[PDB]
PDB file of C-alpha atoms and ligand atoms in Angstrom:
ATOM      1  CA  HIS A   1       0.093  -0.110   0.088  1.00  0.00           C
ATOM      2  CA  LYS A   2       1.302   3.509   1.118  1.00  0.00           C
ATOM      3  CA  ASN A   3       3.381   3.405   4.073  1.00  0.00           C
ATOM      4  CA  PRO A   4       1.683   5.347   7.006  1.00  0.00           C
ATOM      5  CA  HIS A   5       4.681   5.574   9.325  1.00  0.00           C
ATOM      6  CA  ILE A   6       6.724   7.825   6.775  1.00  0.00           C
ATOM      7  CA  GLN A   7       5.420  11.073   6.191  1.00  0.00           C
ATOM      8  CA  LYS A   8       7.320  12.102   3.272  1.00  0.00           C
ATOM      9  CA  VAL A   9       9.641  10.657   0.863  1.00  0.00           C
ATOM     10  CA  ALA A  10      11.893  12.970  -1.737  1.00  0.00           C
ATOM     11  CA  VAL A  11      14.606  12.442  -4.185  1.00  0.00           C
ATOM     12  CA  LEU A  12      17.341  14.777  -5.448  1.00  0.00           C
ATOM     13  CA  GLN A  13      15.689  16.873  -8.315  1.00  0.00           C
ATOM     14  CA  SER A  14      18.753  17.645 -10.271  1.00  0.00           C
ATOM     15  CA  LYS A  15      20.120  14.131 -10.775  1.00  0.00           C
ATOM     16  CA  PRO A  16      19.427  12.182 -13.881  1.00  0.00           C
ATOM     17  CA  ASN A  17      16.576   9.575 -14.176  1.00  0.00           C
ATOM     18  CA  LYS A  18      14.774  10.858 -11.031  1.00  0.00           C
ATOM     19  CA  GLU A  19      11.729   9.224 -11.809  1.00  0.00           C
ATOM     20  CA  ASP A  20      13.396   5.803 -11.519  1.00  0.00           C
ATOM     21  CA  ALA A  21      15.057   7.416  -8.090  1.00  0.00           C
ATOM     22  CA  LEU A  22      11.783   8.109  -6.815  1.00  0.00           C
ATOM     23  CA  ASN A  23      10.153   4.890  -7.729  1.00  0.00           C
ATOM     24  CA  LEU A  24      13.302   3.368  -6.021  1.00  0.00           C
ATOM     25  CA  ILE A  25      12.867   5.157  -2.620  1.00  0.00           C
ATOM     26  CA  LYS A  26       9.155   4.747  -2.758  1.00  0.00           C
ATOM     27  CA  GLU A  27       9.765   0.727  -3.152  1.00  0.00           C
ATOM     28  CA  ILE A  28      11.890   0.826   0.138  1.00  0.00           C
ATOM     29  CA  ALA A  29       9.267   2.786   1.949  1.00  0.00           C
ATOM     30  CA  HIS A  30       6.639   0.361   0.937  1.00  0.00           C
ATOM     31  CA  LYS A  31       8.635  -2.722   1.663  1.00  0.00           C
ATOM     32  CA  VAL A  32       9.404  -1.963   5.207  1.00  0.00           C
ATOM     33  CA  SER A  33       5.940  -0.874   5.936  1.00  0.00           C
ATOM     34  CA  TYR A  34       4.748  -3.779   8.449  1.00  0.00           C
ATOM     35  CA  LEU A  35       8.252  -4.089  10.045  1.00  0.00           C
ATOM     36  CA  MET A  36       7.697  -0.203  11.050  1.00  0.00           C
ATOM     37  CA  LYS A  37       3.975  -0.947  12.161  1.00  0.00           C
ATOM     38  CA  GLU A  38       5.395  -4.037  14.508  1.00  0.00           C
ATOM     39  CA  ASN A  39       8.100  -1.928  15.797  1.00  0.00           C
ATOM     40  CA  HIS A  40       6.361   1.331  16.357  1.00  0.00           C
ATOM     41  CA  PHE A  41       9.033   3.148  14.085  1.00  0.00           C
ATOM     42  CA  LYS A  42       8.009   6.548  12.721  1.00  0.00           C
ATOM     43  CA  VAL A  43      10.220   8.516  10.181  1.00  0.00           C
ATOM     44  CA  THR A  44       9.265  11.906   9.364  1.00  0.00           C
ATOM     45  CA  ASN A  45      11.176  12.421   5.894  1.00  0.00           C
ATOM     46  CA  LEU A  46      12.888   9.550   3.995  1.00  0.00           C
ATOM     47  CA  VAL A  47      15.021  11.344   1.414  1.00  0.00           C
ATOM     48  CA  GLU A  48      17.953  10.861  -1.120  1.00  0.00           C
ATOM     49  CA  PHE A  49      21.456  12.075  -0.590  1.00  0.00           C
ATOM     50  CA  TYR A  50      24.515  11.934  -2.582  1.00  0.00           C
ATOM     51  CA  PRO A  51      27.375  12.927  -0.290  1.00  0.00           C
ATOM     52  CA  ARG A  52      30.845  13.766  -1.641  1.00  0.00           C
ATOM     53  CA  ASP A  53      32.080  11.282   1.111  1.00  0.00           C
ATOM     54  CA  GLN A  54      31.895   7.952  -0.697  1.00  0.00           C
ATOM     55  CA  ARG A  55      31.954   5.935   2.571  1.00  0.00           C
ATOM     56  CA  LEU A  56      28.344   7.556   3.522  1.00  0.00           C
ATOM     57  CA  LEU A  57      25.543   5.231   2.483  1.00  0.00           C
ATOM     58  CA  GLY A  58      22.757   6.288   5.158  1.00  0.00           C
ATOM     59  CA  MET A  59      22.169   8.800   8.075  1.00  0.00           C
ATOM     60  CA  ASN A  60      19.550   8.938  10.570  1.00  0.00           C
ATOM     61  CA  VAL A  61      19.136  12.699  11.996  1.00  0.00           C
ATOM     62  CA  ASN A  62      17.484  12.871  15.415  1.00  0.00           C
ATOM     63  CA  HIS A  63      16.316   9.264  15.916  1.00  0.00           C
ATOM     64  CA  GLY A  64      13.885   9.184  12.744  1.00  0.00           C
ATOM     65  CA  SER A  65      12.976  12.749  12.035  1.00  0.00           C
ATOM     66  CA  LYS A  66      15.005  11.942   8.769  1.00  0.00           C
ATOM     67  CA  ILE A  67      16.555   9.244   7.003  1.00  0.00           C
ATOM     68  CA  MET A  68      18.916   9.601   4.195  1.00  0.00           C
ATOM     69  CA  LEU A  69      19.909   7.018   1.871  1.00  0.00           C
ATOM     70  CA  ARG A  70      22.302   6.896  -0.876  1.00  0.00           C
ATOM     71  CA  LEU A  71      20.625   5.633  -4.034  1.00  0.00           C
ATOM     72  CA  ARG A  72      23.400   6.096  -6.582  1.00  0.00           C
ATOM     73  CA  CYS A  73      26.755   4.496  -6.688  1.00  0.00           C
ATOM     74  CA  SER A  74      29.511   7.190  -5.815  1.00  0.00           C
ATOM     75  CA  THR A  75      31.456   6.696  -8.735  1.00  0.00           C
ATOM     76  CA  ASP A  76      28.712   7.125 -11.451  1.00  0.00           C
ATOM     77  CA  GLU A  77      25.552   8.855 -10.612  1.00  0.00           C
ATOM     78  CA  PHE A  78      23.673   7.156 -13.565  1.00  0.00           C
ATOM     79  CA  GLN A  79      23.967   3.826 -11.804  1.00  0.00           C
ATOM     80  CA  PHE A  80      21.576   2.872  -8.931  1.00  0.00           C
ATOM     81  CA  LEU A  81      22.794   0.673  -6.021  1.00  0.00           C
ATOM     82  CA  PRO A  82      20.994  -2.510  -5.788  1.00  0.00           C
ATOM     83  CA  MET A  83      17.820  -2.832  -4.044  1.00  0.00           C
ATOM     84  CA  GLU A  84      19.228  -5.350  -1.753  1.00  0.00           C
ATOM     85  CA  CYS A  85      21.745  -3.302  -0.538  1.00  0.00           C
ATOM     86  CA  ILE A  86      19.607   0.051  -0.282  1.00  0.00           C
ATOM     87  CA  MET A  87      17.302  -2.254   2.007  1.00  0.00           C
ATOM     88  CA  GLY A  88      20.073  -3.154   4.239  1.00  0.00           C
ATOM     89  CA  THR A  89      21.036   0.244   4.715  1.00  0.00           C
ATOM     90  CA  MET A  90      17.336   0.986   5.528  1.00  0.00           C
ATOM     91  CA  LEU A  91      17.195  -1.497   8.314  1.00  0.00           C
ATOM     92  CA  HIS A  92      20.593  -0.314   9.666  1.00  0.00           C
ATOM     93  CA  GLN A  93      19.560   3.246   9.728  1.00  0.00           C
ATOM     94  CA  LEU A  94      16.022   2.234  11.215  1.00  0.00           C
ATOM     95  CA  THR A  95      17.759   0.597  14.119  1.00  0.00           C
ATOM     96  CA  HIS A  96      19.068   4.037  14.888  1.00  0.00           C
ATOM     97  CA  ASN A  97      15.363   5.081  15.792  1.00  0.00           C
ATOM     98  CA  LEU A  98      16.323   3.377  19.047  1.00  0.00           C
ATOM     99  CA  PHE A  99      19.931   2.775  19.445  1.00  0.00           C
ATOM    100  CA  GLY A 100      22.753   5.571  18.735  1.00  0.00           C
ATOM    101  CA  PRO A 101      26.098   3.968  19.102  1.00  0.00           C
ATOM    102  CA  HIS A 102      27.088   0.693  17.355  1.00  0.00           C
ATOM    103  CA  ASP A 103      27.115  -1.595  20.516  1.00  0.00           C
ATOM    104  CA  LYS A 104      25.765  -4.837  21.284  1.00  0.00           C
ATOM    105  CA  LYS A 105      22.255  -3.258  21.819  1.00  0.00           C
ATOM    106  CA  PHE A 106      22.176  -1.886  18.277  1.00  0.00           C
ATOM    107  CA  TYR A 107      23.556  -5.198  16.517  1.00  0.00           C
ATOM    108  CA  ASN A 108      21.057  -7.240  18.599  1.00  0.00           C
ATOM    109  CA  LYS A 109      18.206  -5.247  17.480  1.00  0.00           C
ATOM    110  CA  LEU A 110      19.374  -5.047  13.899  1.00  0.00           C
ATOM    111  CA  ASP A 111      19.762  -9.099  13.699  1.00  0.00           C
ATOM    112  CA  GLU A 112      16.145  -8.984  14.828  1.00  0.00           C
ATOM    113  CA  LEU A 113      14.793  -6.700  12.057  1.00  0.00           C
ATOM    114  CA  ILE A 114      16.788  -8.285   9.221  1.00  0.00           C
ATOM    115  CA  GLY A 115      15.431 -11.655  10.118  1.00  0.00           C
ATOM    116  CA  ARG A 116      11.797 -10.400  10.585  1.00  0.00           C
ATOM    117  CA  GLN A 117      11.845  -8.518   7.279  1.00  0.00           C
ATOM    118  CA  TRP A 118      12.944 -11.466   5.459  1.00  0.00           C
ATOM    119  CA  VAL A 119       9.836 -13.558   7.021  1.00  0.00           C
ATOM    120  CA  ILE A 120       7.451 -10.426   6.485  1.00  0.00           C
ATOM    121  CA  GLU A 121       8.688 -10.477   2.737  1.00  0.00           C
ATOM    122  CA  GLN A 122       8.148 -14.249   2.238  1.00  0.00           C
ATOM    123  CA  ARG A 123       4.727 -14.073   3.784  1.00  0.00           C
ATOM    124  CA  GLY A 124       3.630 -10.786   2.084  1.00  0.00           C
ATOM    125  CA  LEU A 125       2.605  -8.943   5.204  1.00  0.00           C
ATOM    126  CA  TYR A 126       1.690  -5.121   5.254  1.00  0.00           C
TER     127      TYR A 126
HETATM  128 ZN1   ZN B   1      24.941   3.078  12.006  1.00  0.00          ZN
END
């Protein structure tokens, strides 16, 4: 459906094939809808970014106020990253709605979310 736990999704308007980028990030928002419901996650803005720092794949501002995702390869703005890779980044950043540091609480929760998201996808819950 349309994920009610994410208020707004946006992509970079100056990048090429921004229609495909918007479809991609909308797909991310859609796929995680049931997981966010189960976990009471809310995200105000889910947006694309493309930082010059190529190490940066995602970021979570203020525990869910904004999650930024890299959608495009750092070396080639025309090539989008694999959906599987972006989903991994999304689950990692959703865990930061609860846990800031990359400590045991963080990795424990991320392990639970990865497992549950796979089950949800297999069964088609939403
Ligand atoms: Zn992190």
